[PDB]
Amino acid sequence: PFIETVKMLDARIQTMDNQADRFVTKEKKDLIVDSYIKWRISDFSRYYLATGGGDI
Amino acid sequence: VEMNVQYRVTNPEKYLYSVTSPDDSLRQATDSALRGVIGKYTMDRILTEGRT
């Protein structure tokens, strides 16, 4: 009764990227890189309290 | 040369009832560590391979 809070721990969002990051070759040459990361929640139990809060 | 650090607390009671004023100790030892690393290497090498 008293208070209803269940924040749904979504299992849908898999979109994360790095806007612009720098790296280095062996040949002492600069080369900017960009990539995107895709990831799915797998086992929920450890995942929660593996972060304490579901805040992405 | 300049850098930046990211830090995280695990055991709160050591964060409280130990050396006081945390950011003071953190920053004011990081400077010494940065001197320790930067010292031994030559000017050109610091110019070129600063990131690895």
The distance in angstroms from the start CA to the end CA of chain B is: 14
Reduced DSSP (H G I as helix, E B as strand, rest coil) percent helix, strand, coil of chain A, to 5: 5, 25, 70
- φ, ψ for residue A47 (rounded to 5)? -55, -50
Closest residue on chain A to B48 (Cα): A28
Residue B18 φ then ψ, to 5°: -150, -160
**A35 close to A16: Cβ distance less than 8 angstroms:** no
Looking only at the bridges linking them, the beta strands covering A33-37 and A16-21 are antiparallel
Helix (H) or strand (E) segment spanning residue A20: strand A16-21
Q: What is d(CA B31, CA B25) in angstroms, rounded to the nearest whole number?
A: 10
Which residues of B make CB contacts under 8 Å with A?
A: 48-49, 51-52
Asked whether B22 and B15 are in contact (CB, 8 A), the reply is: yes
How far apart (Å, rounded) are the C-alpha atoms in residues A12 and A41? Answer: 8
- Name the token pair of A50: 């593996």
Q: Nearest residue on chain A to B49, judged by CA atoms? A: A28
Q: Output the CA–CA distances (angstroms, integers) from residue B9 to A24, B14, B15, in the order listed.
A: 32, 9, 7
